[PDB]
From Swiss-Prot:
Function: Hypothesized to function in the shutoff of host biosyntheses. But it seems dispensable both for host shutoff and for phage multiplication. Its shutoff function is probably not entirely specific to host activities.
Protein known as: E3 protein
Protein origin, superkingdom: Viruses
Span of the entire protein shown here: 1 to 55 of 237
Gene: 44
Species of origin: Bacillus phage SP01 (Bacteriophage SP01)
Length: 55
């Protein structure tokens, strides 16, 4: 994940401001900021409108 206004896309679906969203699709428990920092999966991070950035 919950950032100021940095939001993600649930593997190309819904937009949520917390990586717990993708964890649903990724079949994982609570994949969070480690995904962003370690680069686990191809999740996109952008303020509000994502799916074309991944900051």
């Amino acid at each position: 994940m919950a950032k100021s206004n940095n939001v993600y896309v649930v593997n190309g679906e819904e937009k949520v401001s917390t990586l717990a969203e993708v964890a649903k699709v990724l079949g994982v428990s609570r994949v969070s900021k480690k995904d962003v920092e370690e680069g686990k999966y191809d999740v996109v991070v952008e303020e509000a409108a994502v799916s074309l950035a991944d900051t």
